[PDB]
Design a binder for these strands. Structure first.
Length: 613
RNA sequence: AAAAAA
């Protein structure tokens, strides 16, 4: 259709068009086929963006199904390191991170004609960066159309930025959500959610419950606990289809959240912020929102940015509530006090760009000739402090000139879609003749669930993981795993025998192919160091010198820069072989401020590789 | 332990 007619006319008339309304099916599904019916596929590709990987491939499957064509043909997608397309692709669904990474290659995005954006979700640095490059390709490509979805409120900001583009309203029925607060604050959200989910299931009418947890480890612990609490009520109680949802989860398991449970069994979808996307699960009436999210927080006092558990903002709590009243009138179970919401919780979430390290961002820009640092019209302004903070970081790495211009190492690191810390040490391993092993170690660091350690066999998993522990350090331990995997002919029963995640190695093997490509393409020689593993140590140190730490004889370690006590993680290949000097990869903050993936170094390197100190 | 993305 009734307002389909209006959209296709306004899309032909206006170059940039903002859109306020529905999400997923109704938005990206409906919209895209209308333009397909208007013959824009003849002029070039339609590039649709999605916040999450799962949704990018889920709308992409939906559309190819509707369109009739095979998936990966006319309708294809692109997620992670997989290009599930063809030259026959005419409708390509991808993540904002993907289009950005493509625009870095072709800043005129000549492959496309129409660029659909799902930005009615959240604003990530990738989105902030993309929005900038697109503003330029709008002036650079008079022919190119650009639809951008925005949240009802958000809409004014997007219009103003995109040359005062029209804000097209898509109508529909909104359903009321009776919000209910915890009488008094809970001791632990995890358990409380399981108290809630149990109650809701047994007492309340039909409707699938939706829980917002922090991470996999927590969702895993929620589901098991929820299952044994369910099974305890015998065959009397009706079935609950406990559904875990987090990005490490296989697609068959991720997509089953969208599946409508039997007529008597109700389902609980225990997700991360994976499910905060226009990822519109049908038949949800209950939301169990504890008001917590795993996100990055940045301190200018020391350039590092790490994941904390900052509570979800009021603006977010309100959309989570909205996740109930979509199929029909819902109920939002806020696991906090009304006092919490109006006081303890922030009004609206701080944009990624301010709460994250901007070195991997400055490098991206200064690389592609954006040395100006003002010209790129920032939709979410980055504070000049953290900008010059990040600028300084690259000088020490050897990526920026004394004046602030580009360097050889800088331009060489710029060719990889990697963190400057990882970049320096992979570009350096070429100069240091340990590139074969550094390609291994970078790809292995990229994947996270490397080792299999179940709760039912905690001890056995440690004894199996122990066979790989290097006297050298955790980085070389990862190398030992991947190298003994190829040794044992990429055997799946070898992984089962050794307690190694065969999927996580298979994933890491692809990134290694994907990186060897950039390597071989830009003439970076790929060479081994064989038994001379000290070559690897030196090269790791070249990139992670900022992450140097020294053994405090009283307790743990002390940072070379902060001088804040940091401790080797309980898992570490060094956790008991702890040495005087080390370089850590990441920093997990839990019980203690644990150093993630540690390797031994000789302090005599914090000058051989970091004279800018 | 990595949230999300590459």
């Amino acid at each position: 259709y009734k307002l389909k007619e209006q959209l296709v006319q306004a899309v032909h008339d206006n170059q940039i068009l903002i859109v306020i309304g529905e999400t997923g099916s109704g938005k990206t599904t409906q919209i895209t086929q209308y333009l397909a019916e208007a013959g824009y596929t003849s002029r070039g590709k339609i590039g649709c963006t999605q916040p999450r990987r799962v949704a990018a491939m889920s709308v992409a499957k939906r559309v190819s199904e509707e369109f009739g064509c095979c998936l990966g043909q006319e309708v294809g997608y692109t997620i992670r390191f997989e290009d599930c397309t063809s030259p026959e692709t005419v409708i390509k669904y991808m993540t904002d991170g993907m289009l950005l990474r493509e625009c870095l290659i072709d800043p005129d995005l000549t492959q496309y004609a129409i660029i659909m954006l799902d930005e009615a979700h959240e604003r990530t640095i990738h989105t902030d960066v993309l929005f900038g490059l697109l503003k330029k390709t709008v002036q650079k490509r008079q022919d190119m159309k650009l639809i951008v979805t925005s949240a009802t409120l958000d809409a004014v900001k997007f219009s103003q930025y995109f040359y005062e583009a029209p804000i097209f309203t898509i109508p529909g029925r909104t359903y009321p959500v009776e919000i209910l607060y915890t009488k008094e604050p809970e001791t632990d959200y995890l358990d409380a959610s399981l108290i809630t989910v149990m109650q809701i299931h047994l007492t309340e009418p039909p409707g699938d419950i939706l829980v917002f947890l922090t991470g996999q480890e927590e969702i895993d612990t929620a589901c098991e606990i929820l299952y044994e609490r369910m099974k305890s009520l015998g065959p009397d109680v009706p079935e609950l289809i406990i559904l875990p949802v987090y990005s490490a989860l296989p697609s068959e398991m991720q997509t089953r959240i969208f599946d409508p449970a039997p007529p008597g069994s109700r389902k609980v979808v225990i997700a991360t912020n994976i499910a905060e996307t226009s990822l519109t699960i049908d038949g949800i009436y209950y939301v169990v929102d504890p008001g917590f999210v795993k996100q990055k927080v940045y301190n200018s006092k020391t350039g590092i940015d790490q994941l904390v558990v900052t509570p979800i903002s009021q603006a977010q709590a309100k959309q989570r509530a909205g996740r109930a009243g979509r199929t029909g009138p819902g109920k939002c179970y806020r696991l906090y006090t009304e006092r919490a919401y109006r006081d303890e919780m922030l009004t609206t979430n701080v944009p990624e760009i301010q709460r994250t390290n901007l070195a991997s961002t400055v490098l991206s820009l200064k690389a592609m000739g954006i040395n100006d640092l003002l010209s790129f019209d920032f939709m979410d302004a980055p504070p000049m402090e953290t900008l010059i903070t990040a600028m300084e970081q690259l000088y020490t790495l050897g990526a920026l000139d004394d004046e602030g211009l580009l360097t050889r190492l800088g331009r060489r690191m710029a060719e990889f879609p990697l963190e400057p810390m990882l970049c320096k040490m992979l570009i350096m391993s070429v100069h240091l003749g340990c590139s074969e092993e550094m390609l291994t170690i970078v790809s292995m660091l990229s994947v996270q669930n490397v080792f299999y350690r179940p709760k039912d066999k905690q001890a056995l998993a440690d004894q199996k993981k122990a066979k790989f522990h290097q006297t050298e350090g955790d980085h070389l331990t990862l190398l030992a795993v991947y190298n003994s995997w190829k040794n044992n002919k990429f055997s799946n029963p070898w992984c089962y025998e050794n307690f190694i995640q065969a999927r996580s190695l298979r994933r890491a093997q692809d990134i290694r192919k994907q990186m060897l490509g950039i390597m071989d393409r830009h003439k970076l020689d790929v060479v081994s160091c064989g038994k001379s593993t000290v070559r690897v140590q030196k090269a790791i140190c070249s990139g992670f010198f900022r992450n140097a730490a020294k053994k405090d004889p009283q307790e743990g370690y002390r940072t070379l820069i902060d001088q804040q006590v940091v401790y080797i993680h309980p898992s570490s290949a060094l956790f008991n072989r702890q040495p005087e000097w080390v370089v850590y990869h990441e920093l997990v903050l839990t019980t203690k401020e644990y150093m993630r993936e540690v390797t031994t170094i000789d302090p005599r390197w914090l000058v051989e590789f970091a004279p800018a100190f």
